[PDB]
Design a protein around this motif. Sequence first.
Motif, PDB file in Angstrom:
ATOM      1  N   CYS A  80     -12.748 -22.099 -55.154  1.00 40.01           N
ATOM      2  CA  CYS A  80     -11.906 -23.179 -54.658  1.00 40.01           C
ATOM      3  C   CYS A  80     -12.693 -24.401 -54.213  1.00 40.01           C
ATOM      4  O   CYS A  80     -12.101 -25.476 -54.064  1.00 40.01           O
ATOM      5  CB  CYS A  80     -11.050 -22.699 -53.480  1.00 40.01           C
TER       6      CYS A  80
ATOM      7  N   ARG B 137      -5.725 -22.152 -55.257  1.00 41.58           N
ATOM      8  CA  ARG B 137      -6.111 -21.403 -54.066  1.00 41.58           C
ATOM      9  C   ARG B 137      -4.893 -20.971 -53.257  1.00 41.58           C
ATOM     10  O   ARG B 137      -4.910 -19.899 -52.641  1.00 41.58           O
ATOM     11  CB  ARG B 137      -7.053 -22.241 -53.203  1.00 41.58           C
TER      12      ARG B 137
ATOM     13  N   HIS C  73     -14.719 -17.296 -51.491  1.00 43.28           N
ATOM     14  CA  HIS C  73     -13.666 -16.944 -50.554  1.00 43.28           C
ATOM     15  C   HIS C  73     -13.105 -15.569 -50.906  1.00 43.28           C
ATOM     16  O   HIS C  73     -13.348 -15.022 -51.986  1.00 43.28           O
ATOM     17  CB  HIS C  73     -12.564 -18.002 -50.563  1.00 43.28           C
TER      18      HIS C  73
ATOM     19  N   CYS D 172     -16.932 -22.429 -51.163  1.00 44.36           N
ATOM     20  CA  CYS D 172     -16.504 -21.346 -52.037  1.00 44.36           C
ATOM     21  C   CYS D 172     -16.832 -21.694 -53.482  1.00 44.36           C
ATOM     22  O   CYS D 172     -16.743 -22.856 -53.888  1.00 44.36           O
ATOM     23  CB  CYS D 172     -15.008 -21.084 -51.885  1.00 44.36           C
TER      24      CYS D 172
ATOM     25  N   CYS E 117     -10.113 -16.370 -53.063  1.00 42.67           N
ATOM     26  CA  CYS E 117     -10.692 -16.911 -54.285  1.00 42.67           C
ATOM     27  C   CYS E 117     -11.590 -15.878 -54.950  1.00 42.67           C
ATOM     28  O   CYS E 117     -12.753 -16.157 -55.258  1.00 42.67           O
ATOM     29  CB  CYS E 117     -11.474 -18.187 -53.986  1.00 42.67           C
TER      30      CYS E 117
HETATM   31 ZN   LIG Z   1     -12.295 -20.353 -52.093  1.00 38.66          ZN
END
Ligand SMILES: [Zn+2]
Lengths: 368, 316, 506, 182
Positions: free
Chosen positions: B60, D81, B77, B57, B80
């Motif tokens: 992240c 996250r 993501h 990602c 994300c």
């Molecule tokens: Zn991510």
Amino acid sequence: DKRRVAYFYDADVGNYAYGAGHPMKPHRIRMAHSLIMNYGLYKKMEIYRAKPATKQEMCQFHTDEYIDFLSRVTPDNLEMFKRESVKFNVGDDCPVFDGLYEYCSISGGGSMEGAARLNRGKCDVAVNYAGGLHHAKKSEASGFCYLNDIVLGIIELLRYHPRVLYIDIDVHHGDGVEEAFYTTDRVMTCSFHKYGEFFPGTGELRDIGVGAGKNYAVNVPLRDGIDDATYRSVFEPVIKKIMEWYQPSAVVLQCGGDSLSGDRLGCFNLSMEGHANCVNYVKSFGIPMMVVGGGGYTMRNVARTWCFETGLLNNVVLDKDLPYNEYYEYYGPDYKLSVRPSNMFNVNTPEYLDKVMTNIFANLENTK
Amino acid sequence: TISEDSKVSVTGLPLNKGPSEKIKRESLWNDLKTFLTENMTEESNIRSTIGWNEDFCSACNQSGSFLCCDTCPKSFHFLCLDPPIDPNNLPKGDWHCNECKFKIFINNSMATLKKIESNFIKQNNNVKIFAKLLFNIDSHNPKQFQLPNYIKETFPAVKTGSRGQYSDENDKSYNPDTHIDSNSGKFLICYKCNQTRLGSWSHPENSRLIMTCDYCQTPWHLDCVPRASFKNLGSKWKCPLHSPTKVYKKYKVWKKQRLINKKNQLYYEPLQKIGYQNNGNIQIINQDFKITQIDENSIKYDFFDKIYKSKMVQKR
Amino acid sequence: EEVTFFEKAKRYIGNKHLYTEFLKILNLYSQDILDLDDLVEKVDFYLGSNKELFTWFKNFVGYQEAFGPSYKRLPKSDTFMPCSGRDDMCWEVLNDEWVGHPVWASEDSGFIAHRKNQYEETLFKIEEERHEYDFYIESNLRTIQCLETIVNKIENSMTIYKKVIRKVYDKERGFEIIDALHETAPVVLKRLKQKDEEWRRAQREWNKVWRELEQKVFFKSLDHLGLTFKQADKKLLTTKQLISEISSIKVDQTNKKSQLDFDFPDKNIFYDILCLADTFITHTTAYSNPDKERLKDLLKYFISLFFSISFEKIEESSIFNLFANTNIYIFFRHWTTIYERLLEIKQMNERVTKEINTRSTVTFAKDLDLLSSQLSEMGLDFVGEDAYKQVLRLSRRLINGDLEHQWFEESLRQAYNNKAFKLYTIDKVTQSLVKHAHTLMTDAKTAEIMALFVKDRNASTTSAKDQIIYRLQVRSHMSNTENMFRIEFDKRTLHVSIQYIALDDL
Amino acid sequence: ISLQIPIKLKSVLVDDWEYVTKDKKICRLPADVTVEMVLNKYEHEVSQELESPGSQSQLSEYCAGLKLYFDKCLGNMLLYRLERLQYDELLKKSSKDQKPLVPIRIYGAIHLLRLISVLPELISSTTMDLQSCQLLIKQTEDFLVWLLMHVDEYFNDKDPNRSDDALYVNTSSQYEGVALGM
Ligand SMILES: [Zn+2]
Ligand SMILES: [Zn+2]
Ligand SMILES: [Zn+2]
Ligand SMILES: [Zn+2]
Ligand SMILES: [Zn+2]
């Protein structure tokens, strides 16, 4: 005693299979039923085909979204269910097969019907070997278990019984059942499990419960390779103390076959007689009791153990020779109704176990 | 009639050939029946409730499902993303990164400064200091928050894990050699039992397992303190002979000061040495993380004074 | 009695690093940060092994929820999720605030699985193949029965049949055939019957091969300690192992003269050990005939002198003290190990004798279809031939070399249910014992100490001076660095006491 | 450039990092004290003592710019996250009521503290002139000092398992799986 013994079995339970290499095969129940049948015990049971559970019945414990996902998940449309699979842990550990919903409904209906028969007084002894799923907890699939039918059975029994005792003999701790009843004081959960770097990860000696459930949970951490004598010497006094100082109106026993020697994933050194001993000793108390078949990955050993326990519940002792069941080839060398314990070392020590019993008794001192 | 049925089985065979003769040579040396149940399975329904573009990602820096851009090889993501995009509620269109869309739409190399000064004079009325940052943040992709490499380094006992997680100094048949020092050859004597309890090869049952605590190296018996197994996957095992470093006073919470680099670690010694209302941050022999020097002999007087006070207050 | 208490605590802890932590805990309590419970718990963990300091401590300071480790508490906003079946009673007894999620309880590290031998893996593979065959056959047979019932009803459990049809029809036509069936049944039934016949033939043949594969492997899987006994015995039957054991016992005793205590409840095992030793000595091509005779004569003489058993009965089948060095001690340890193994085999002999003699065979299919006499053709089935004496004969065969170790171990497993795995290395232990006797006689110092033992033992009536003079005479031949052993023997009850004097005689 | 964050604030930041990334906890949102009451209290308490019109007005400008920047950047680079799930949940609930999300009205005192930790790193990627760089740094340091006297009312030591008023809340197994699984 010669208690009236009910027996629940669906003939279709053996037609559902897990993955090719998966250690769960419900067909173990099928050669268990075949062994009980060919021993001439069907003249000693009333055999029932319990109605499969409905969505609302298993929604008593599990979330409605979890049940809805379970009733619609299928190996052909799993890619439409990505968030649900990871949210409910229905991935690799607990996979999806063709008859997942059917098997879960059958097991839940069997457990519910056994509890209902105990409540109504139709029997004092009922057997359901399609249950034993004690790992799933109300929103997820864990330990190859998807529906905690034990919780539903305990719920049904509590309708007519003020106090209910749950006993776990599987090397895995009863995480789901204990979690479902970690705060209530009407349910005793007592798990004799192997504790360490083991799959349950929980079930330590200091998990007696929270709130009104304080000192209402009993955990038995055990080392590898415990044999029949040590297991009995640990099991019997604790069970006697629980009977004395808690006096449940009913007891539920999970007859997991993982403790048996030669287990695929088990590490204990329990044989045939050492595993039937706890069942017989518990039955010797005289209260309404449940039998659910949980762990066990060697279908021959677990099926023989289940047949012998069924015989023991009927106050009879089965012979060592086999009655030439359909699946005769599975029993290998001598085709005898026994399980051979191996020669590996036992790590359990009298000092550690004495400390465990002392702590358990101190915790139990405030249960009466 | 289908011939593709015989594909494969666990036996490595189409389930129709036979014992696989190579397997033969490898694996050789040289009270009625069950059809009565259907007429006796009494269906019981007496239930009480029966009536009811890369592999990581770009925000992240981890692995998982990605929504990459066709123009920017930067996989993202779904959580994300700013804002997060529900996979069921797919946009179903040309998706680009914040930097990607900024570089593909408003890419005016000559007149970027014109937009910069336009935003600057727009924000000049109220917030001129932050105008440049307010413009620039729209030119950047969504990201996962991370400490700026100097908040971490003021505490030496803190390290960053694999995926950016926080890590500290607590991360980590018959075997008679476990009782040996393995450095000096001396037997490991448990603190409680004051024995090694080596046992014997003839009778391994007499042996008692020992751990050799990770922190202070004090050996302990698995039966002396109740413990089912060893510690091999979890955190470094700590002996029961260490400071709690965290107390839930009856509720209130107490914590021990985190370790700081010695360059910024200031020290001070009290001139009283009779009674000091100080924390557990003591040393046995910016002014917020000082380490007091407790002057051990003073502890003998202090503890005694406290217990005597508790004795006389409870006396009355 | 308080500053002296501090000094006693400092001495008992015996470590500056642990005393520092104890002082830190004491201060943490002293700054009104720790309560009485935790302070007394830490004092119990530090000095609680002592019963005089801790008891006074509890009686001088006036000492006079329990949340689980694997259970978290979730916020109330993360609790209410509509459960349709949950009634008021079902709402009251269920717990929803606390969850375990064993990932949290595993420290995100995972779990450690058990170790299984390859025989168990082969058994599991056979199990998997059997389950596949039987599950497919049973599901197909159930679908066959359902289709037969439908056909019988057409002359004038919602997914099992669909799965069977899909498995049988693999050309993606199975869906069409299922749809046609829902609205063409006999053809499906006959195809299922043909598939059943093929699967049953394959299952019969595979059951055969699985069976003879299982026969050669089942007993080896349960031999957990027996599979690795050879190497473990090789490693752990060294002089260093015994020295470490006895020194650890002595250290534990001194951290508070009978370090080792051996009991001999039989006198006929010695004859069996003599027979095995002479068999090895005759068989081995490593000593000359005079050396072989010296081995045999020295063994017989030493045993007769020590145990006072006999001098002719061995050839036709007061408290004494022996001051011995390392070599004699290790030789005696080998002898005691062999005797203990043979005694362990002999004590329980009657039960295996009965079990082997009273070994019932199932007549339903064993004696009717599948007969297995692989270990009975070669004759080590222990039919008759009392298990102790048959085991002795088999050991003599193995020493001679006409019996393989594989078959010896398999027969031992089958006759003793993996409870006699310590006899797998009996020949090697006897060889080591013979080598130890050879070393004992071939060294001048050991020979002289052995002569001194002969003199002292044959004296048999000596004053208290005998111990001192014996020790000094041993020490004259004996070095200042190696260790002495005081092997005390009581002939009245055939009990041997062993004491470890490393260098405590100087 | 050279931001002299107090040692206690660095410890608080690393404690938050541990709580989120290791203990799998999220902030109890909406915060009891979000960004606006704390910033307005700072402005009211400090600007009332200033007498210079420039110094008093630039404090208000700095507070407004801090609010604007926090509102702009919370969803971009001030969330881990794990907290992205909470962010998406808040966005969904806000869109359900047609209310635009105003993060200064939800997050507080711990996300602003983490906002002012990469400000030297954020200004570095601009053409921001040096004469105002020092002004921004000095204003940030003054705000940090004001927070430094008032620490007992914004970062308390409370156990989520013992009080629901604690600043952190345990994340469910389902929540953790959804947050860190996709
Ligand atoms: Zn991510
Ligand atoms: Zn289990
Ligand atoms: Zn892009
Ligand atoms: Zn110890
Ligand atoms: Zn330690």
